[PDB]
């Protein structure tokens, strides 16, 4: 979680927002996915959110459903995803890396063991998509024992009790999906929550700037990156060019 603390301190000093792309690991293959992720970083991503393909991604809409299918078609497994994570961390020592996981993949071989593997490869946070705060105890506990930030979603239908739990329980950042927005953001700060990243349908530069203006620490593009991969499957080179240009533009919007 320390990489996030360092990142947000750096951005705060520059009066700048964070821009964080999501991609599915191994979409559309391992080699291309590694290149995609390097492109995202070189173009100015501040952190990554990386999904491990799961058979049943309940929290995910059609774009990410299709990305999971492409990765499975390429034979991607969680073991291969952890190999990729080691390679990414090896090339990029400071960028915060967050995983988007489904509960079964974390519980499968033991929750403690999963977080220990995260710590060993150099992952910084884990968001378990189908674990609400009410069910979160063993996940958050194992995360913190292994120096992993447990990331929680603050949904649009969040009440005060939930804001307080997410503020207490989370580290790294709060994943905001958005009570009025100003209220959610104010309350999270009042409750000393992890800095908020707005993740609701972020697909254009102006949305990044608006998120920062609203008081959020930055924005997460939950599917726009994946859409670019999907739109350009037939041409890997053009895919990278379009990713670089998009991330470039989104990051530019976060600058003071």
């Amino acid at each position: 979680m320390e990489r996030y603390e360092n990142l947000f301190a750096q951005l705060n000093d520059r009066r700048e927002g964070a821009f964080v792309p999501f991609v599915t690991l191994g979409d559309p293959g391992i080699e291309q996915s590694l290149k995609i992720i390097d492109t995202l970083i070189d173009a100015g991503a501040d952190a990554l959110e990386l999904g491990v393909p799961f058979s049943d991604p309940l929290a995910d809409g059609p774009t990410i459903q299709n990305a999971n299918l492409r990765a499975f078609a390429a034979g991607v497994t969680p073991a291969q995803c952890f190999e990729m994570l080691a390679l990414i961390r090896e090339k990029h020592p400071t960028i915060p890396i967050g995983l988007l996981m489904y509960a079964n993949l974390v519980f499968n071989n033991g929750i403690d063991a999963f977080y220990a593997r995260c710590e060993q490869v150099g992952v910084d946070s884990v968001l378990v998509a189908d674990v609400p705060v009410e069910e979160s105890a063993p996940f958050r506990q194992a995360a913190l024992r292994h120096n992993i930030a447990p990331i929680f979603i603050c949904p649009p239908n969040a009440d005060d009790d939930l804001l307080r739990q997410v503020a207490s329980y989370g580290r790294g950042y709060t994943y905001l999906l958005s009570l009025p927005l100003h209220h959610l953001i104010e309350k999270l700060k009042e409750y000393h929550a992890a800095p908020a990243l707005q993740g609701f349908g972020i697909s254009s530069p102006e949305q990044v700037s608006a998120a920062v203006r609203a008081g959020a620490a930055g924005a997460i593009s939950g599917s726009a990156i994946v859409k670019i991969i999907e739109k350009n499957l037939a041409s890997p080179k053009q895919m990278l060019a379009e990713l670089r240009s998009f991330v470039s533009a989104m990051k530019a919007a976060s600058r003071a």
């Binding site: 254009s204 530069p205 102006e206 949305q207 700037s209 203006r213 533009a249 530019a252 919007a253 600058r255």
Partner: protein, 394 residues
Amino acid sequence: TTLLNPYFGEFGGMYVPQILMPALNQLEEAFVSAQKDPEFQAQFADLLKNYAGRPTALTKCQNITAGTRTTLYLKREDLLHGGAHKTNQVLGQALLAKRMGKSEIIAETGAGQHGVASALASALLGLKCRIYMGAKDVERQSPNVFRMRLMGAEVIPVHSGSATLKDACNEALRDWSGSYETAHYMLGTAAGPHPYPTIVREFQRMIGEETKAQILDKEGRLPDAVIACVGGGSNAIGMFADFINDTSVGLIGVEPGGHGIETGEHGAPLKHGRVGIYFGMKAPMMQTADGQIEESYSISAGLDFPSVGPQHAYLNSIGRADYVSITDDEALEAFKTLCRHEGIIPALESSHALAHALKMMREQPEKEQLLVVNLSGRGDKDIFTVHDILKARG
């Protein structure tokens, strides 16, 4: 559909190809949002004070009115950073571009002042700036082209049409239609398609707000009239806006009369043109009988444009503002008079406004009147122009 009224009576509108409408709608939305955002206002105010130097002086000019019953003040936009009022609105537009998450600026320029203003605002605020300028204007304005390059802008000569300001104006719009996702078009006057006449007015309206406070402090009443030159309309609407609802205050805009209205060599479409549609707006313009856009002329490149912003056409139509013209010779006499009597070198653009105020005084020297001229810019840039005319003249 729009958030704000695109028209001033019958004038104005959004006469652009369909592909540009999302750009104009996005900008209008960002502007409406910015105008309700105290943080945006505070940022803009901070740049205007600490970078550009606002508030500007209001100077009482005693020598030039001596022995008449005119009291003349000059609002000193010539003291703003950059040497003209253009700096006010380029700072606001640069802030809007950043609000929208844009990293790049496109601008047109004729005289080159707007190019320089766009470039300096871009330099300060970390935006990548490109400027379009008719090839004829490029050749005429080597000092300004060099300034733009020093400030890190790219200058792109325009060879289409008449290779002058209107052609630069068209090319800026052409570029933006392709680039608006990443680039903001920093239009240089209170004209063009909505929302620009409205944005530029609001980002220049501090001129009249300061003038009102300053004249109240110094004279305990409002002016009898405020007088400003009109090239596209920004300095004049910035001076006029805060006085529109003070119905006793006269609003006088001065168009360039060139070699004389009767010669056809002028830039006075509001009084001597006819309504047409060009540059995204329905507005008075100089045009041929068959509806081609005419070439304007003024000694002052800053006033040399064959149309005018739509709010001025509207204020004239309802009789709220009165529009007059001043010839090259009248402007040159005012330029000389201000240098000699007050030690201020005015822009030849501003000299048209001063010339008309001098005419108001001289025609009726026993009329009691309290006048403010918007001195929109300084005239160091004009000394070569003025030298050359005086020499030719003998």
